[PDB]
Structure formats: C-alpha cells, structure tokens
Amino acid sequence: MKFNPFVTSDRSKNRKRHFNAPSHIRRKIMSSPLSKELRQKYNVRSMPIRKDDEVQVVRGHYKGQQIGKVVQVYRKKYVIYIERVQREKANGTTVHVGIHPSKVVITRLKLDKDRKKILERKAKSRQ
Amino acid sequence: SELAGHQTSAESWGTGRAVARIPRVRGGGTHRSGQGAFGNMCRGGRMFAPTKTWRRWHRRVNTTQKRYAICSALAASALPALVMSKGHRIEEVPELPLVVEDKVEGYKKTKEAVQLLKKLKAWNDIKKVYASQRMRAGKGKMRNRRRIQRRGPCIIYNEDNGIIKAFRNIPGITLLNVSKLNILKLAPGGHVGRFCIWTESAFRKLDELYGTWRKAASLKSNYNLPMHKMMNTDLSRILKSPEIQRALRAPRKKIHRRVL
Amino acid sequence: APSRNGMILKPHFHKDWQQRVDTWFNQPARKIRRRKARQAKARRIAPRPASGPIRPIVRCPTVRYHTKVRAGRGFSLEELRVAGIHKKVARTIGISVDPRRRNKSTESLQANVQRLKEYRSKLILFPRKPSAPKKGDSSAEELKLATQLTGPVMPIRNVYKKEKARVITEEEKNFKAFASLRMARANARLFGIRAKRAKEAAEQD
RNA sequence: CGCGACCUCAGAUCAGACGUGGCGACCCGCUGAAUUUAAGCAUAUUAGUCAGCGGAGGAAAAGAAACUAACCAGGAUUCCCUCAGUAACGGCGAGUGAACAGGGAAGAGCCCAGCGCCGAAUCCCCGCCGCGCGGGGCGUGGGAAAUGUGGCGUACGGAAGACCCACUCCCCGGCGCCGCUCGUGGGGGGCCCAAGUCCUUCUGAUCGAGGCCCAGCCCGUGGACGGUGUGAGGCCGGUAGCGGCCCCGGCGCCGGGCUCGGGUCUUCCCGGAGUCGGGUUGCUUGGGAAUGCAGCCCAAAGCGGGUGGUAAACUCCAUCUAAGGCUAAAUACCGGCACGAGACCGAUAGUCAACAAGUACCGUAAGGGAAAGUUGAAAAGAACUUUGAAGAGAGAGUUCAAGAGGGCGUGAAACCGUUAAGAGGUAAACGGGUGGGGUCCGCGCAGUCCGCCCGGAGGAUUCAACCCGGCGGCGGGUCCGGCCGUGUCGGCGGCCCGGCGGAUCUUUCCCGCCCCCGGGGUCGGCGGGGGACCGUCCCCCGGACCGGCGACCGGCCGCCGC
RNA sequence: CGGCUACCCACCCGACCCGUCUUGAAACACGGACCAAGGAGUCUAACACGUGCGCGAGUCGGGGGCUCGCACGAAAGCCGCCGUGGCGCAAUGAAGGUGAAGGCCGGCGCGCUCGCCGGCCGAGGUGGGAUCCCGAGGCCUCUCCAGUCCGCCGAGGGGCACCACCGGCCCGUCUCGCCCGCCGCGCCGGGGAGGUGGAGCACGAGCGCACGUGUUAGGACCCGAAAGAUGGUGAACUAUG
RNA sequence: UAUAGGGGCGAAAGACUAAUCGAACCAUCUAGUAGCUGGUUCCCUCCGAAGUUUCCCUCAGGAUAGCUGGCGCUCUCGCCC
RNA sequence: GAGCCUUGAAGCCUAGGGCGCGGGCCCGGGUGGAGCCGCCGCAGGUGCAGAUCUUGGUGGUAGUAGCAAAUAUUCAAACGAGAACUUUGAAGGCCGAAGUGGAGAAGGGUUCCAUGUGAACAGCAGUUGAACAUGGGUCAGUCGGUCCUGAGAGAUGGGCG
RNA sequence: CGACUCUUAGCGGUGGAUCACUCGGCUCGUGCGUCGAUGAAGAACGCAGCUAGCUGCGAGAAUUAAUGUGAAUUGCAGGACACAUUGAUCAUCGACACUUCGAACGCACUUGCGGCCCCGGGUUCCUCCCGGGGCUACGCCUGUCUGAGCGUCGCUU
Ligand SMILES: [Mg+2]
Ligand SMILES: [Mg+2]
Ligand SMILES: [Mg+2]
Ligand SMILES: [Mg+2]
Ligand SMILES: [Mg+2]
Ligand SMILES: [Mg+2]
Ligand SMILES: [Mg+2]
Ligand SMILES: [Mg+2]
Ligand SMILES: [Mg+2]
Ligand SMILES: [Mg+2]
Ligand SMILES: [Mg+2]
Ligand SMILES: [Mg+2]
Ligand SMILES: [Mg+2]
Ligand SMILES: [Mg+2]
Ligand SMILES: [Mg+2]
Ligand SMILES: [Mg+2]
Ligand SMILES: [Mg+2]
Ligand SMILES: [Mg+2]
Ligand SMILES: [Mg+2]
Ligand SMILES: [Mg+2]
Ligand SMILES: [Mg+2]
Ligand SMILES: [Mg+2]
Ligand SMILES: [Mg+2]
Ligand SMILES: [Mg+2]
Ligand SMILES: [Mg+2]
Ligand SMILES: [Mg+2]
Ligand SMILES: [Mg+2]
Ligand SMILES: [Mg+2]
Ligand SMILES: [Mg+2]
Ligand SMILES: [Mg+2]
Ligand SMILES: [Mg+2]
Ligand SMILES: [Mg+2]
Ligand SMILES: [Mg+2]
Ligand SMILES: [Mg+2]
Ligand SMILES: [Mg+2]
Ligand SMILES: [Mg+2]
Ligand SMILES: [Mg+2]
Ligand SMILES: [Mg+2]
Ligand SMILES: [Mg+2]
Ligand SMILES: [Mg+2]
Ligand SMILES: [Mg+2]
Ligand SMILES: [Mg+2]
Ligand SMILES: [Mg+2]
Ligand SMILES: [Mg+2]
Ligand SMILES: [Mg+2]
Ligand SMILES: [Mg+2]
Ligand SMILES: [Mg+2]
Ligand SMILES: [Mg+2]
Ligand SMILES: [Mg+2]
Ligand SMILES: [Mg+2]
Ligand SMILES: [Mg+2]
Ligand SMILES: [Mg+2]
Ligand SMILES: [Mg+2]
Ligand SMILES: [Mg+2]
Ligand SMILES: [Mg+2]
Ligand SMILES: [Mg+2]
Ligand SMILES: [Mg+2]
Ligand SMILES: [Mg+2]
Ligand SMILES: [Mg+2]
Ligand SMILES: [Mg+2]
Ligand SMILES: [Mg+2]
Ligand SMILES: [Mg+2]
Ligand SMILES: [Mg+2]
Ligand SMILES: [Mg+2]
Ligand SMILES: [Mg+2]
Ligand SMILES: [Mg+2]
Ligand SMILES: [Mg+2]
Ligand SMILES: [Mg+2]
Ligand SMILES: [Mg+2]
Ligand SMILES: [Mg+2]
Ligand SMILES: [Mg+2]
Ligand SMILES: [Mg+2]
Ligand SMILES: [Mg+2]
Ligand SMILES: [Mg+2]
Ligand SMILES: [Mg+2]
Ligand SMILES: [Mg+2]
Ligand SMILES: [Mg+2]
Ligand SMILES: [Mg+2]
Ligand SMILES: [Mg+2]
C-alpha cells in the first residue's frame, strides 16, 4: 500500500507522467528481465535494453526459443526491434515488428564499462 | 465553477426577431453568434441551482448514541447467527470471540500472521476475499477506484508492538484499537455482525472501558451500559409457559366460509 | 407573504452575502498546523515548560463572575517588590509581569506573593558553568521531567471554605429578614434627600 | 571699488545612490451610485458595497490604554465560540444592529522629543597602511554634516545625581574540525523481495483448477501505471529510524573590539498646541442634547486634561496620560510556483478552451468569440491483373474481424433506395369483436401423463426382525465430584503487601503561614498531606431461588451410523 | 395441430388534434414540419407542526485541547476541576422591583365579615372519565364435607390522562380601613379583605440529532422587459467650423 | 483638423452622431423587478373543492374566514336496557 | 451475492416466446468487442410532448421559383479522351476620346509573371481563371517621404486636483 | 396485367444518438512566498536540412558552457559510431549570451535628425566626410565644483 504523501495514485496523472516521460526515464521504463542462468550469475533481476545485447522473445506471436538480437530501441514508442522478428509488406518487402521490452527476456549483455558499474551497483544494493 | 454560464455577455432580442425571447450572444462571422445564452434549457449554459460549496456535508451525532451503536455492534458480533448471516466463513472456527494470547501483537513478519490465521481456521474467509476481488462497476473506475474488496476479519488489539506491520498486507483485513472503536469498521455497510478476532488484553480491557450494569465505566467518566428493554427476548417460551396459557381463550380454528 | 400562524422572522440576508462566506473546510488542517507548531515549540524549548510564564491569581471584574477566580496575564510590580526579585529579571526567570495591573486588596496581594514564593521555591534553573550560585550539583536528572502541561506549576482550580456545620445562635431567628434588605434599599435610595432635609431644617433652626 | 564669512538660491552628461512600471486572490487610504425591497415612493434598504484612483508585503493593518467596569475588579494587539439577532437605530414601517464580560489559539515588549550632566566622547566621505574562502567590516591621517544641537547615560512601570551596605568577572560579531538536528535537518541523480513452470481456451495474455502432510515463493513491498484483456509477483514504481554518493544551514571548542549591578537614606528633575474643547455644516455609525471623521470660526490649563453611554450647574469618587514612533505570534489568500485528494463532470456535460483556444472568425475601436476526441494489438494503410483519362469499381492481399479502408470503435431515430408480403374512391391514423394470409414458436401429430400401494409373472444382492461389540447425539431423576447467576449475614478479613466518590468528619494528627506574651499559649483562622464512618467492587466457608440460551461425569429408557 | 401478441389486410359499431388561459376549445383562439441530445421546485439560514432515536430536570462539545508520523485518518476515540456557553427549569411590570402549598382536628382572645398556637400527611372540591378492586347470584356423574376443577355478573369503591366549573397562590393596578418591626422611629419598611389585566404557579419535559410538510430572506421552479448607474470606444457614414 | 453621449452638431426635419438616435456603442452592477404570458418530465390506490364573508390606492392581487387533505388522540357496541 | 464475462460485458435491432392492470422487466435470435448487474442501506445535477424551448441532423414544398438591367453573334482549324464558352484566322457588331482606352492617390497585399494538375472553389461547362502547387519578380543624390510651418495637438515653468 | 401511394421486415445510404474509454476540467487541502532602471509584464520580427501552426529559443537564435545519467533522435538521406580520448540523447542548470518596441531613457518615432570622447580606414587634422565602441530622459538624496543677490556683516577705495 502507498504511504508517501508525495507520490500519487491518480490513474490520469500516472498515465500522463508515463506517456510524457523524458528520454532518460524512458530507458529505465523499457527494462527487460534476464534469463535464469544469467540472473544467478549477475545477482540482478532486470536490466535496461541497449542496441548491442541479444534477447529472446518469451510471449507474443513471434515467441519461441530462437535466440535473437535487437537492432533498434524506439524509446518514443516504448518498443524494440529484432532483425529476425519481421513481417512482409503488401509488395513483399521486409519490415521489423515491434514488441514491448517487458515481454522479452535477455540472454546476453554487452560488457561495457558503464554496464559493469550498473551491475555491481545493483548487486551491492540487493546485498 | 460558479461561472459556468455567466462568462458570456448577452441580451434578449424582444418582440421583434421572432426567433425567440431567450438571451442570445452578440457578434457575427461565427456560427456561435446568436445561440442560446446562459440558462437551463440552453446549450453551453449554466445548470439549474449550481451546487454551492457551503452545502451541509457533515452530520453530528450524540456521543451517547455513538457508544450505543458501538455496544450494539459488539453484542451482535458475539452471536453466531448474526455473523454467519453476513457472509463470513466461521464454519471451522472453534470459538466465535477469538481471544488469543499477547504474543500475537509482537509479530514482525506476515508469514507467522498467515500461519496463525490458518491455525485459527479463519483462512477460509481470507480465501473468499482473495476470490472476490472483481473490478468496480460503472463510472467509478475513472475516479481512482477500480477495485472491489470484501471486508474480512478485524483484529482488535492494544499496546501495539508491530502487529500493524504483520496485518497491513492481508486483503480484506481491518486493524482496530480498543481505545478507538469505529462503527464504520465494526459494522460496515450498516449491517451488524462482523467476525472479530481479539487479544487477551483487548478482551480484558472491555470491562473497564464500558463497564457493567453494576459499576460504570472507568475510562469514560459519565458513561454507563445501555439499558435492557425486554429481559427475555424469546417469544416462544413466554407464549408456551403455563402461566400464560393458564387463562387463555379457546383456539376456535373453524373457518366459517361463505354459504351459498 | 405570511401564513396562518407562525413566528415573525427578520432574516439578515438582504445584503449580498454569498460573495463573503467563510466555510471551515480547513479546520482539521488548521488544528494539525497548531498541534505541530505546539510540538515544535515545546521541542525547541524542552527544558522550559509549555506556557512557561507563570500567571497570577485573578478575580473576575463583573458581578456575574466575581464569585469564581481565574488566571491572568502577569504579576504586579507591588507583588514583585514584596517577593523581593527585580522587575526585569523575572521575565528571563519565567515570571510574566503585568505593569498595568494595580493592587487594591491585601487579601489578593498575599495570595499572589505566596504563589510567587512557591514558584521560586519549585524553580530550578540551569547555569552556563557551575560557577553560578543558587543551584545544586545535580539537576535532578533533568528535573525528573522536561516539560509541563496546562499551567507551569499549578492551575487555577477553585477552592472553597468548608464551614461544615454549626449550632444556631439565639437571636438568629430574628436576626435578618426580607424587611432588612428592604430597609437597606430604602436608605440607599433616600440617603441624600434626608441629608438635604436636615440641612434645610438646621437652616431655619 | 574690492576682498571674505554667513544666509536664501540656480547649473552640469559633476562622484555615488534611489523612485517610476507590472501582477494585484489576500490587505491599507479616498469617494462611491442605481437596478432591488419598502407590494406605490422621496427618509430608509441595497451600501459606507459594485465600478474608479492611489501603495506594499507574504502576509498587511492593528498593537502597550487620554481602556473596560462601578465589585472581592480586570489589564497590548490579533482570530474563534458565546454574549446576540440582544442594548439600540428606523416614514419605530420595511428593515438595520453592536459592545463589555467569560472560555479558548498566541502571548514580547520597548524607543524617542522634552527636562539635566558629559571640553561634540557623534556621524558621512576620501587615501595609504595589518586581515579570510564567493567580499565586507575592524585599527591610522584629512574633507564635510552638526552648538538653530551627534551620541552614551534617560521614558511615566518613575528617572538622575552624592554617601552607606553587602556583591558580580560576564556578554556580544568570523575563522578549521569531529558527533548530531526527531520522523530519525533541507535539495538533487541512480539502486534494492517474490512464477513468467506444467495443461487447456484466445489474434494476442493478465483467463481458467492444482502445485506433498506445513500448504508452490515474497510480503513493513497485494496502491497505481505501462505492457496484444481482467497482474502482488514480466517492467519504472510501492514498505522499510534501507544502504552508498554530491550540495546548503545550526549546536562545542583555538586570534581580534566594548564592558559596574541591587536596597535604604539625603538633593534635584519629570513631558508632545491652531492641539483638546466649543459653536456650526456635511458624511458616517446601533450610538441616542449629535459614536467617529472632515471644512470654517472661536481657541486654552497646569491640584491640569480626557472618560464614566441624557443636555446644564454645585460637590465627591474611579481610571488613563492623548496631539511622537518600532515590533513576530494565532488571522486571510478565487493571483503565482509545486504537490496530494475527491460519494463531482465524462465530449450538447466539465473552465470559453481534453484537439495548432483566447485559435479561426466578426466590428474602425472598446469588445465579442466558436465548432472540432476514438482505424487497427501491431499500418501490417490494400502488392499485383483488369475497366475507366481520372474520380471509382471488379478480383486479389493483411488482420480474428475491411461487416475497422486515412474525422475509419460501437452505429439509433427523422429521411431516402431496393427486395418480399398485403391493400387502395369518402385523407391517413385510432378503440371494441372476429375472420383470412405470412413469419416464427412447441409438439409429431387416429401413437404418447407422472409418482405411491397391492395382487401375479423371471433373475441377482446385502441389509432390515432379533442379539452382540460399539461410537455420536437427544431426555429427564440424583444436581451426584465441581462450575457461575440473583439476595442476606458472616472471616472488620484484600483498608498499611484494594479502588472511586461524598459542602459526613477527626482544630486533643502532621507540614508551611498567622494572633498574643528563640520559646510558650488552640486563643482562633488559611493551603496541602495522613485516617474514621458512609454507597457502589475482591476471595473461602455455611445456607435462601432458577439450574433457566453455562456446562462435565456416574446410572437409566428410547434413537442413528459403523 | 395450437398460438395472445408490437406483421399485413376486411368487414360491423364507435370514433373531431394534442398542451394550457377560460363559465365555455376540435374550433375561424394561441404553440407544435419531423427526429436525436440537454431542460425546470434545488441548496443555505431561521421558524411552526408531526414522526424516529438517545438522555432526562436536565440536555448538547458543533469551539478548542490530548494520544503516535500515517493509504483508508479533513474519519474515529477521549476531555471530567474544559459546561465558558445556548435551550429548559419562573413569571409579572415602562421601571425602580417583587416573585407562586394546600387540607384535617382542638383551644383561646367578643372561634368576632376574627388572628395565633399545637399534631399529621402534604398540591383542594364537584360532574364525566379507559383501567383496576370488592362483590349478592347462579353455571361442572348417584351424596352433608372441601381446597383447584365450570365460570360470567347486578350493585358499590379508590379513580390515569383529558374536559367544564368553583376555590387557592404570584406579579402590575383601583377601593376600604387596621396591625407589626426598627443598624435607627422618617412623605422608613412589611402585612389584609374585595374587582380586574399577565404569554403565569397550582409534582416539572426539555435538550441534541435525522426525516417530511408549510411560510419566509437569499437570482430561489425555469425563460422574458420599457428603464437606472459606473467606466471606457467611436466625426472612415453624417451635421458643422 | 476641432467639437463625444443628457454631450457634440443642427438655414430646425427633435433631423445626424459608423445600416441603431424623442438620448450611440462596449463591459459590469445583472440571473435587475414584474400582482403579467408560456412551460414545468414515472405508475398505481384512496380522499377530494372554491369562485363565497370581512379588510387593503383594494377590482388580473394578497390577508382572514369557509370548502379540502393528512397526522392522530379520547371513548362506545360487540352476551326488562 | 466464493455474482456473470474474450467459449463474449455494455450498447443497438428484431412478423420470436412470455410476465405485470400499469410504470417496466425476463428469455431467444442478429450485430457488437470489455465491462456489468441482483439484494440491504445511503446521496442525487434522476424520468419530457410541447415553453414562437437551446444545439445538431433530415423531409413535403421541389428538381419548383429562379439562372431576363446595359443591341450580337457566326464560320474553319489546332492543342485535347472530352469544345459553344480556351487559342489562332476571317466575317458581322459594341464601347466612340465625359469610353467597355492609356495612367495614377486611398484602399487590397502577392492578387503581377512562368510552369503543371484539373476533386473543392468560378452559381452550366471548361483544356480557361484574380483557384490550387512550385519557382521568380519591386535596383534612385536629381520620383516622393525625410526639411518647413498652416488650422490644430502638445511637455517642462506655474496653477489645480 | 402494370405504374403511384400506404403499412411492416431484410439489406444499403445520409445522419452521428446510446454505450465504453480519457495526457482535460471543477472542488477541497498542503508547502513556498519569487517581477523590474544590473532593463518587468506585454508586443513585433527572425531563427530547424527539408518547417505552415503550437511549443522552445535570440544573429552563439528548434540552442552554448558545466554537472548527473549512460548509446541515441526519428518522417526521410546525412552526420559526429568514436567511448583502454572528450560520451549521443535526456534532465538539472549555479557559467556565457539574450534582436526592436515597450516604465523605455538623446529629440521624436514617418527606422529621421543629431551632440561629445576614443579606435581603424579617406586629401595621414579639424573644418556638418565612412565603419565601430561608450555616454547624452525626469524627479530626488549626500558631497564637490561653478556663480547671483541695494538679504545681513567686517576690513578697506
Ligand atoms: Mg484528477
Ligand atoms: Mg458549462
Ligand atoms: Mg456573475
Ligand atoms: Mg454577465
Ligand atoms: Mg453504464
Ligand atoms: Mg399560500
Ligand atoms: Mg413590486
Ligand atoms: Mg417605480
Ligand atoms: Mg440585493
Ligand atoms: Mg449607507
Ligand atoms: Mg472595487
Ligand atoms: Mg506601485
Ligand atoms: Mg513582492
Ligand atoms: Mg505608555
Ligand atoms: Mg439566544
Ligand atoms: Mg441615521
Ligand atoms: Mg425587520
Ligand atoms: Mg448599514
Ligand atoms: Mg493492466
Ligand atoms: Mg497490475
Ligand atoms: Mg519488480
Ligand atoms: Mg478639565
Ligand atoms: Mg480628573
Ligand atoms: Mg458624572
Ligand atoms: Mg449622566
Ligand atoms: Mg502613542
Ligand atoms: Mg502610536
Ligand atoms: Mg501573523
Ligand atoms: Mg454527480
Ligand atoms: Mg463546443
Ligand atoms: Mg489504371
Ligand atoms: Mg469494426
Ligand atoms: Mg466507425
Ligand atoms: Mg408490391
Ligand atoms: Mg406537458
Ligand atoms: Mg389570465
Ligand atoms: Mg371570454
Ligand atoms: Mg383544448
Ligand atoms: Mg388552435
Ligand atoms: Mg389569430
Ligand atoms: Mg404555427
Ligand atoms: Mg432527455
Ligand atoms: Mg453556566
Ligand atoms: Mg433579465
Ligand atoms: Mg428611477
Ligand atoms: Mg460617461
Ligand atoms: Mg470627415
Ligand atoms: Mg442620464
Ligand atoms: Mg445611422
Ligand atoms: Mg441614459
Ligand atoms: Mg430567473
Ligand atoms: Mg377582489
Ligand atoms: Mg377539516
Ligand atoms: Mg464477435
Ligand atoms: Mg478497446
Ligand atoms: Mg434535471
Ligand atoms: Mg424531444
Ligand atoms: Mg420553436
Ligand atoms: Mg456534430
Ligand atoms: Mg429542406
Ligand atoms: Mg423551370
Ligand atoms: Mg443580371
Ligand atoms: Mg483531336
Ligand atoms: Mg475567337
Ligand atoms: Mg460598326
Ligand atoms: Mg475633360
Ligand atoms: Mg475613365
Ligand atoms: Mg492549369
Ligand atoms: Mg461552375
Ligand atoms: Mg494572374
Ligand atoms: Mg494562390
Ligand atoms: Mg544615374
Ligand atoms: Mg525630394
Ligand atoms: Mg496640456
Ligand atoms: Mg508642476
Ligand atoms: Mg438503417
Ligand atoms: Mg552541450
Ligand atoms: Mg517618450
Ligand atoms: Mg554607434
């Protein structure tokens, strides 16, 4: 239950602050869970999505065990794109299909100097 | 807003301009020039009798009547019929007033709380609460109210040691204190007979907080227990007692219908 | 306009009143603000009690309330002088002083100076260093208490002389009467007239 | 004639500094109507409001009695409840209408002109010298202001000066630091628990039952949002005196400059003027032989002056010291910057404005002022063939759905087109009662009613009669070994190792005062505490009534299942 | 085969187009071409009555304060030496002011159109008055005996509330006369018997909350003027220099 | 270019003053008042009128009485009077 | 109400069945695609046939009145799917110098020019346009403003408020 | 037989009602108390690769510098892709910059007309010659300078 008198429970206010969130908050909103074998390795639950990391769809129409990779993170639409998750147009040209990052589970992360810092910070905070 | 219709400056035409006599806005070059001005029957006008902010919202009640209602709810919560006819699952409960030891108020986790609720055979009501958690019906969902939750048991305690933490996450539960008994929580919806779970000290403090018919209350200065009207509320024994039937009339159960 | 039978009414709603209506929708918020302010002041002044300045014994002026006694603003300069403490030091000691009030009755003067002496005897102040006199080695472990409520040393609770019971004297059966009050009122009404009559009689001699 | 000083004055693009205007919800000063009511209307009410003008601050004004009362007196101001719809005002008609108490929130008090003393011990400016981070104040020397009057010492609550007496060593302004401040001081960024596992619907899942005997896991975190629908656990987020990081403000301690209070006695000093008040004329007030303000005239005193609610004279009494000033508090806030909430509205509603809304547009101008939300989960917005010049359409294609095809969710009525049925010279329509046709409904139409008992026709089963073992419940007798309710005494026992109240007492009890002659005398009184009797409550014994919705065992009749 | 109906058609009978102003409406009286959405007795203060609830000669914490910071808590709980205060418990006069107990018995002074004393209960009497109490009388298998057994009633008594009258008490007035007291012997006080005026007393019933109706002030069921005031904009038309 | 609303201007028609002039336009008081017209939304059941007395600057109105409804309350029959 | 629901909520339609005297309600069928309802109490901005009611939409009238002020058009060809309205040539006419001409001031503000399409605008049509889309276009010592005062408006000195 | 008209049902069209949704209002409360001569409110113009409006900005013009965060914005090509250099976006924002009018300030505003001082180019100079920079409004306060008085005074011709 909510107890802080400075955070709201208004549905309209929450929807407004979610739909008009800045770009540095959209990257935190667009977070995806990690795989089971990697969660126990990194001692962290979730992690934001970047352009280089691989990912695997768990729910939706284009779901399965085929490992994929992201190619675009569309922060404006709160969506990500995968090179193999695609669809044919009327004329036959290929185009990526949008899937929400909350409906996808990560299997590989780009080991960056900032990513390692975020991982160790989350691990030390989880303790 | 108290100004919902009087923002427009408009006057009526009069006898001529047979369109109407209702005031109409002045201007031109706009399809709103000449429409209905402020009024009940007009579009974009003020409503009839604009609700003022100084309406009588709150209603005060006598303290004696408040205490009467609280004692009535407490007496109704002790009868199994009145609390069973409300909806609570008390089929497996050993004793209707559940008076537990003082160790429960020292709880810090909710696992032991759920374990105690399952041991006291009161978990069926919480399961019913979990099962009946549908969505609000109607336009109330827009006004930050999208959940319907049925009321479950209320643990009445005293001398808090962390029991609010252990009972603050169970749905349908209610936390109440002996020194602050609320009618809105004891008899929700205007119906008496809510299932209650007490503590040893919370149950021993009732004799000193309200008093008996012999001695008045110690906490409350000038309060005494309400008077009892009918000493025997069982009509069957009174009507079937030999003293009543000793000087009765013959039954005379003949119908005497209409004769042709 | 009137009806069959009813009390004639004169409502004072002929003015434009709806534009000035004070609704008390901020009453709980105001009470919460006042409570928080009281708590903050008491926490800031913790060694001193709430409503610190001691208030004297004050009798009500009017004849309707002159039977009971109540609190007041401050002690008089005469009471301070009989107590023996300086006028300006009482303010920092914690004694409210009212220079405008006078003293007309020794019965109240003695009560006020006794209250002042009791306050001074019960008072215990803190020094900067132990070099200041009129104190003890240990301050009673924060004086057994930091703050007091509803009066610094004692409220103004009323006391009454007992006069339990006594034997009726001999002449009490014919001591007073309604005729006594009637004669008193008649004399108070005809006091000056009798004096003028005696004067004009002695003038003729 | 000139020079110099003073005094009324002029100029500068002289050096330094200040005001203008805007917002104006709250506040202060001025004047400011009428619509309305009075069933008409002049007084009155509307109203000392609206409109108009001038100013400031987060509050402003008010604020330390020229006060209230007439008795056991109270004591700045502000706000709330009562006083009170009262005293009173009013063509005494309509109507208007306070104040003092009292209880509360908060409670902070002072300064100066004057009278006198101090060799003007005062203040501004300029410049070099000794100091600290983001830059301003302490010590030195001359140029002005000021004797037509700086500053300390002084303020009506008295003060000052000179002896006597016994005393006080302190306070106020920066610099470096450790540890905290009550929600555990303030601001900012990021992080922190728990299923996405089996099976089955669905375009899609958050749907649907369960996860061993410790109840699949967490919970101080089951509020909310977003995600292909309806999530505690999939994701920011929420609980948590949770953690780590950065910035700001105070509490204790190391240099620098000022620095005699209290009482008695003796001596001296002690006050605001065209102002009060009076006449008069307007406005205003509930204020009436005139509450307050203002214009003109008359215009003072120091045992004085003001007030004491009915004008005037004589006398007494009570209170205050006005024509000088400063001050936070509780109070108000429809504007401004942020936040939270809703028994409110849900696109003809709610602010005029949910959208490129004070926008389009209108009038020269002041000014007036709109209409207008919804494709789809995802554009995946219809490739391609054909007809037509194109608009458009026929196939085809995406989507579960095109019956969602670019103001496209759902898709009513008025109106119109087509198809089917019926009818037609007194306009159509309508109520009462039939008949004909048609859609549709239920039945399968010479063939459909159900359950009980008995007498017969054939087969298979254990039980029922009765007894035994045995558990569970019902009923009353003994109220048996015990439970408590309603009353009377009793252990005077829980009074000190038990609670309340009482204008019931105990001055031969105590403590702190007080009267008379350190001490004595109750000779009397005041406040607090201690204890005796009274009416309500806590244990055992003995018995009086119900054994009743309070219940157990022993024994019995009569039931049920195993 | 059966089927009323919100399907259509036909015959028989009756059948003028709705709403309100009016004695009179289908009217040659007014409004309505049709359809969809919106649309009118509300809220506050005060008063009167009735009803429900709680307490009861008391009632009411709405104003503040207390417990712990809280989503539900702008709630709820408490004050007890916070009842200040409002209403009611006392009315009558302009005011100074005054301000509500009867009944029985005996005695004395001329038991005198006459006061006092002593004892008792203690708000008078009459005529009605629900109800209650007593009650002659008779009502149950062969008989003198009984407590229950069957079981009503003539008459009589104390009489709720309420009704009518008489009397009694209080306050303001008019007439008549006499008596008593002295913190001081007076144009000082008090008392009686009769007639009247009072929103009075004569064992009290109000308070707080809610609801319903009715009246009233608020724009007050909704829509509607000719007009008045305040402050600003117009001589690009027109009149005049 | 000057005169701006009880004002201007008028060889005078009370004519003109931004299509409005026997008193312009704009916003506010203002939802001004109306004893005067119009309208005033669901069903069933029960009861069910008056246009009359008196007074008012009263005659298209109101007050009063009367007609009506609701809430009750106090009693009476039900076993030769 | 351990209420109903993506195996289908609300809403809408219906020669279907049925209930209640009635206000209304239940079920069946067809659309529809995400919420809704019964019971006990509570509070309303709660029920429409009208008010020359407000807003929006649609009919009869009705394919009707009307496309008639200023003498007048015709032939051939080209570009074009499409010709009476465009273009060119010819013939016949009008304005006839107080014009139906050539330029300006006020006012309009891109309307001027070139290219291109032809649903909207042009009261029929259009290949045309002052419409639409794109791109260009205004060159000053000696043209005028800028200078000067006219009727007149206006700050300081001063006065009033 | 047909046509027209009328009444029902199915489908279709105009129509946009009901229902469901809501980044919007209304009301209540809390926290703070902030404009400007060092140029306020408001107005005009301009600024994006392709850009008309809203929004955001000022010739440094769809943002500059710094800090925090950490791999993007997006309708389309390009572009810094680099991060064991300095690193995109976003937010914060204390540092720079902020066109004209506007209390508006040199006079008036028709963007004209000037007046002083200084710096670069013109006859290497003023003398009504180009560009750039600073100042040039009113009232008032303290002080300085200048100077008017048959207002008063002293010494002197
Ligand atoms: Mg909201
Ligand atoms: Mg509105
Ligand atoms: Mg208004
Ligand atoms: Mg208006
Ligand atoms: Mg609904
Ligand atoms: Mg009436
Ligand atoms: Mg009138
Ligand atoms: Mg009039
Ligand atoms: Mg008014
Ligand atoms: Mg007035
Ligand atoms: Mg005003
Ligand atoms: Mg100002
Ligand atoms: Mg300010
Ligand atoms: Mg003073
Ligand atoms: Mg009163
Ligand atoms: Mg007057
Ligand atoms: Mg009145
Ligand atoms: Mg007045
Ligand atoms: Mg969801
Ligand atoms: Mg959820
Ligand atoms: Mg999580
Ligand atoms: Mg005098
Ligand atoms: Mg005097
Ligand atoms: Mg006097
Ligand atoms: Mg007098
Ligand atoms: Mg003063
Ligand atoms: Mg003053
Ligand atoms: Mg304040
Ligand atoms: Mg509502
Ligand atoms: Mg609109
Ligand atoms: Mg083609
Ligand atoms: Mg669709
Ligand atoms: Mg649609
Ligand atoms: Mg046909
Ligand atoms: Mg009607
Ligand atoms: Mg009429
Ligand atoms: Mg007639
Ligand atoms: Mg009619
Ligand atoms: Mg008609
Ligand atoms: Mg006619
Ligand atoms: Mg008509
Ligand atoms: Mg409607
Ligand atoms: Mg009292
Ligand atoms: Mg009107
Ligand atoms: Mg008039
Ligand atoms: Mg004017
Ligand atoms: Mg002209
Ligand atoms: Mg006039
Ligand atoms: Mg005209
Ligand atoms: Mg006028
Ligand atoms: Mg109205
Ligand atoms: Mg009449
Ligand atoms: Mg009657
Ligand atoms: Mg479907
Ligand atoms: Mg949807
Ligand atoms: Mg309505
Ligand atoms: Mg309608
Ligand atoms: Mg109409
Ligand atoms: Mg529309
Ligand atoms: Mg038409
Ligand atoms: Mg024709
Ligand atoms: Mg023509
Ligand atoms: Mg051709
Ligand atoms: Mg040609
Ligand atoms: Mg010719
Ligand atoms: Mg000519
Ligand atoms: Mg010409
Ligand atoms: Mg073209
Ligand atoms: Mg055309
Ligand atoms: Mg052109
Ligand atoms: Mg164009
Ligand atoms: Mg040339
Ligand atoms: Mg020229
Ligand atoms: Mg002038
Ligand atoms: Mg001047
Ligand atoms: Mg249709
Ligand atoms: Mg940058
Ligand atoms: Mg100027
Ligand atoms: Mg320059």
From TrEMBL, chain A:
It comes from Mus musculus (Mouse). It holds the Pfam family Ribosomal_L26. GO terms for cellular component: large ribosomal subunit. Belongs to the universal ribosomal protein uL24 family. Residues 1-21 are annotated as: Disordered. CDD domains: KOW_RPL26 (cd06089). Component of the large ribosomal subunit. The ribosome is a large ribonucleoprotein complex responsible for the synthesis of proteins in the cell. The keyword Transmembrane does not apply. GO terms for molecular function: RNA binding; structural constituent of ribosome. Component of the large ribosomal subunit. Interacts with DHX33. This is Large ribosomal subunit protein uL24. GO terms for biological process: translation. Keywords: Ribonucleoprotein, Ribosomal protein. Residues 48-76 form the KOW domain. InterPro entries: KOW, Rib_uL2_dom2, Ribosomal_uL24_CS, Ribosomal_uL24_euk/arc, Ribosomal_uL24_KOW, Translation_prot_SH3-like_sf. The keyword Amino-acid biosynthesis does not apply. The gene is Rpl26.
